[PDB]
Structure 1
Amino acid sequence: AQPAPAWTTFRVGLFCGIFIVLNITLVLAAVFKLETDRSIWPLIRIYRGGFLLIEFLFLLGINTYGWRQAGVNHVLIFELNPRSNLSHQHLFEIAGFLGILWCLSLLACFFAPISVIPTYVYPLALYGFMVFFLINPTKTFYYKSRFWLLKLLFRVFTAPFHKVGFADFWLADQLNSLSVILMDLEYMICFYSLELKWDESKGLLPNNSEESGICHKYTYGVRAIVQCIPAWLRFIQCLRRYRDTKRAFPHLVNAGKYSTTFFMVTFAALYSTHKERGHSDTMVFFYLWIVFYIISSCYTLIWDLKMDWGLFDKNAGENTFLREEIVYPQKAYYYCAIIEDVILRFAWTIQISITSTTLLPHSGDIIATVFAPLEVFRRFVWNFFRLENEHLNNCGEFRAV
């Protein structure tokens, strides 16, 4: 736990200050300099994924700080290099720099500094820069960390061909809580495929003001698939883990849990298409979707509250509705975590459903763009206690001990 250099602290402070001032400027520009004749929704949907990634990186930095200060040995659990581990300052710095890029791109999109440069390339430029940062072969910007992330992501995406370590499962679950990022990426690529109107200078902000685009409606069904990939990877990873251990509890339980949200997305897309054609069984399929929503959300909430966190232990004794031993300084943190998780499981499931072409009016987009940051926050608070429990008592039989 070597302290970070003062230069890194200065850099993260600089990035945070630039980010907060740029965000205040963004809010002021949105309040003052914006056109209501053109639909700002494509811009919001495109930049929502980037904003969620920035929030996830910042919350992960907070997670690393809390882990290293509480006592949980995250570097041992993640199997990272003890000497080359990344401090929370580095994660904060990366989040700040990427937020700088995101805010600059959004400001450029709001009012184009250059008339020649179209406003529809700024999101493309920002995401291309992000992906280049992720793939950059030159060993300048966190080359060890970036290469480890690239290798682990490649391993995760090839779920059934490698043994599921803790880190692979961890990032797969993070993606399970970051389905909005991939879904917005799919929306962006299809939108670029069809509805930019390259001739238009403000093509990314259509002047129709009424949402009737082919990509806005998810009747094609690709939205459902790209929403199930985060669950698909976890499902097959847990199946491979079961094949490795030949132990049903909890591997088949996890497979069932992820199939609940698989059927969630499939049913939501199907009955949304059914409603779009006004067929009589729309109400029956909506009922099947509501009961599947309830069972899936309850399943994930109970598992997160019982096995992932480890709470509600019978051997707790003094600790009410908790474990026998705790690492974090206050039990009120644990309690508020339980209520937060309870509400945000419902929030996560309803966000999945509503973005799965359920609520066509603009209120659906508002509430989804509101709930996605809440989903990332819930994943961060879940990560806290998941890592703490993993250190305390080995769950999921990852380590030999």
Structure 2
Amino acid sequence: PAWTTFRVGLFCGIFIVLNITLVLAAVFKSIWPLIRIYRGGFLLIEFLFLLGINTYGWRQAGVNHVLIFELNPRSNLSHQHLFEIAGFLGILWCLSLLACFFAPISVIPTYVYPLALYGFMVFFLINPTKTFYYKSRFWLLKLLFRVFTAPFHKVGFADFWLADQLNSLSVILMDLEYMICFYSLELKWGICHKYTYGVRAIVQCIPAWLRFIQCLRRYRDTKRAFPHLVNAGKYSTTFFMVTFAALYSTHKERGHSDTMVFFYLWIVFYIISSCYTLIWDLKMDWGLFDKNAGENTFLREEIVYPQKAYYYCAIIEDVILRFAWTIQISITSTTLLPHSGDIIATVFAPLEVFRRFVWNFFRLENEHLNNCGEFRA
């Protein structure tokens, strides 16, 4: 419409100048348990902005995300609605961060602002009224329920898609668990940030678990090995690499002798998982490297996005950014580098969400083009 574009603009403007205020206040006016609680909100808001850009790219390149997602052909969500809700959550996040930097009210402590921000973010998603995108949030909530109880539902495309998006937003779950940990060891006036009791691995791999059991259930319904089992083979390796990094870290802590062979085995599993996910992305999730492309030498038969430079840069971008996701996951799950941890993670998490954005535009393209995931017909 027009009021929606106006609100997109208003929210984007307030957001950009609030970010300027934020940078200036950070330069002038143990910070780690503070930038370890706001990283979740930051990644989520960046993901919603980039999902808006994804919806625009789909709607304009030609691919239809309304038939694929089993969405309703009327009452849709164009990119402006995602931009507006992302900008709203971003304004809320910026305000909470600024109230944490300054201290507007003296009687209220500084630990209530992350609590209040996430309370608002959760209340906006379970608002029982008929307001603030009632149908949209009540679709997303049913989808979240059908995802987090994976083996008991037939896997549509929204299920598989959100499972993978969560497979990229693992830092948000890690930060939720870390904040739940923190607000038991805070001081209303340091067991967390380390593997308390294997919890930093269970919460680290729970999206891999969701997607792995979803693929297994798709196999059970289809009784077709390929690809519902070769695809479980790309999500099981996350379990292996995470648990082996954690075991190697604990053995280095205790000073055992097999720490060297554990490091060798972990680097083997890490490189195997990186190569697995990379070849999968470049072969089945994207359909590239096809045997039938004359002038599209390393692409499909027909392409949807105009400039082949897009594909040619996205390939190498994914090749570089897939080795960063596995490294970030391993480092976050291993308490080995006290200083490089939570800064390499803070630098490699937005890059991971960006990689997931690119993967979204060339997975949905390949889907609409070739019925890669056998979901219809």
Instruction: State the TM-score, normalizing by the size of structure 1.
Output: 0.93
Seen in structure 2, the aligned counterparts of structure 1 residues 342 and 188 have a Cα distance that, compared at 3 Å, is same
Partner Cα distance (1:292, 1:24) in 2: 42
Q: 2: CA distance between counterparts of 1:239 and 1:294?
A: 24
Alignment partners' CA distance in 2, 1:73 and 1:388: 9
Give the Cα–Cα distance (whole angstroms) in 2 for the partners of residues 195 and 117 of structure 1. 15
The 8 Å contact of residues 246 and 333 in structure 2, kept in 1 or not, is answered as yes
1:357, distance to aligned residue in structure 2 (A): 2.4
SS class of match (1:398): coil
The CA RMSD over aligned residues, in Å, is 0.9
CA–CA separation in structure 2 for the residues paired with 1:23 and 1:279: 48
- Note the alpha carbon deviations across 1:304-356, whole angstroms, 9 max, x for none: 00000000000112101110100001110001100010011100000001111
Note the C-alpha offset of 1:195: 2.6
- Give CA deviations for 1:239-262 in whole Å, capped at 9, x if unaligned: 000000000001111111100011
Question: Cα deviation per residue 1:373-392 (whole Å; 9 max; x = unaligned)?
Answer: 00000000000000000000
Equivalent residue in structure 2 for 1:341, among 318, 329, 335: 318
Please tell me whether residue 43 in structure 1 is matched to residue 34 in structure 2.
yes
CA shift for structure 1 position 359: 3.6
Matched-pair contact (CA < 8 Å) for 1:47–1:123: yes
* Displacement of 1:122: 0.1
- Deviations along 1:124-174, one digit per CA (max 9) or x if unpaired, are 000010001111111110000000000000000010001001110000000
> Structure 1 residue 285: deviation in Å?
0.7
1:111 Cα deviation after fit: 1.4
Q: Which moved more, 1:161-170 or 1:216-225?
A: 216-225
Report if aligned partners of 2:37, 2:176 keep a CA contact under 8 Å in 1. yes
Q: Answer whether contact 1:219 1:273 (CA < 8 A) is retained.
A: no
After superposition, the C-alpha distances for 1:160-218 in whole angstroms (9 at most, x for unaligned) are 001001110000000000000000100000000223445xxxxxxxxxxxxxx210222
The alpha-carbon distance between structure 1 residues 27 and 359, as it changes in their structure 2 partners (threshold 3 A), is farther
Moved more, 188-197 or 5-14: 188-197
CA gap of 1:196–1:175, structure 2 versus 1, over 3 A, is: farther
Confirm or deny: 8 A CA contact 2:43 2:353 kept in the other structure.
yes
Task: Classify the secondary structure of the residue corresponding to 2:292.
Answer: helix
Q: Is the 8 A contact 1:268 1:358 kept in 2?
A: no
1:284 CA drift (Å): 1.2
Flag the 1:380–1:196 CA change in 2: closer, same or farther, 3 A: farther
Contact 1:75 1:82 in 2 (8 A): yes
Q: How far apart are the structure 1 equivalents of 2:216 and 2:132?
A: 36
Q: Does the 8 A contact of 2:63 with 2:364 survive in 1?
A: yes
Deviates more, 1:290-299 or 1:267-276: 267-276
Q: Distance in 1 between matches of 2:48 and 2:86?
A: 5
1:79 corresponding residue in structure 2: 70
**Could you tell me how far apart the structure 1 residues matched to 2:344 and 2:6 are?**
37
**In 2, Cα distance between the equivalents of 1:188 and 1:219?**
13
- How many residue pairs get aligned? The number is 377
Name 1:327's counterpart in structure 2.
Answer: 304
Separation of aligned partners in 2, 1:399 and 1:165: 9
- Cα deviation code 1:218-272 (max 9, x no counterpart): 2521010001100000000000000000000011111111000111111111111
Deviates more, 1:353-362 or 1:97-106: 353-362
The CA deviation at 1:74 is: 0.7
Cα distance in 1 for residues equivalent to 2:285 and 2:336 = 32
Q: Is the 8 A contact 2:58 2:64 kept in 1?
A: yes
CA distance in 2, matches of 1:136, 1:270: 42
SS of residue in 1 equivalent to 2:237: helix
Q: Is the 8 A contact 1:344 1:375 kept in 2?
A: yes
How far the C-alpha of 1:291 sits from its partner, in A, is 0.4
Q: Could you say if the C-alpha distance between residues 288 and 79 of structure 1 is closer, same or farther in structure 2, counting changes exceeding 3 Å? A: same
Question: Would you say 1:353 and 2:330 are equivalent positions?
Answer: yes
Q: Do structure 1's residue 64 and structure 2's residue 60 form an aligned pair?
A: no
Deviation digits for residues 48-69 of structure 1 (CA, Å, limit 9, x no counterpart): 0100000000000000000000
In the other structure, the counterpart of 1:221 is: 198
Contact 1:156 1:233 in 2 (8 A): yes
- Asked if the contact 1:265/1:356 (under 8 Å) is kept, the reply is yes
Corresponding residue for 2:246? 269
Rounded Cα–Cα distance in structure 2 between residues aligned with 1:160 and 1:138 = 30
Find the residue that maps to 1:311 and give its secondary structure: coil
Unpaired segments ≥5 residues, structure 2: none
The answer (yes or no) to whether the contact 2:304–2:365 under 8 Å persists in 1 is yes
Instruction: Look up the SS of the partner of 2:52 in the other structure.
Output: helix
How much does 1:282 deviate?
1.2
Whole-Å separation in 2 of the counterparts to 1:42 and 1:143: 34
Task: Tell me, yes or no, if the aligned pair for 1:8 and 1:90 is still in contact at 8 Å.
Answer: yes
Structure 1 unaligned blocks of 5 or more? 34-38, 199-212
The answer to whether the 8 A contact 2:194-2:200 is kept is: no
CA drift of 1:358 comes to 4.1
Equivalent position SS for 1:362: coil
Moved over 4 A (4+): none
**TM-score calculated relative to the size of structure 2:** 0.99
Which has the higher mean CA deviation after the structures are superposed, 276-285 or 147-156?
276-285
C-alpha separation between the residues in 2 aligned to 1:360 and 1:41? 14
State whether residues 120 and 196 of structure 1, in contact with CA within 8 Å, keep that contact through their aligned partners in structure 2.
no
Q: Name which of structure 1's ranges 262-271 and 90-99 shifts more when overlaid on structure 2.
A: 262-271
Q: CA deviation at 1:85?
A: 1.0
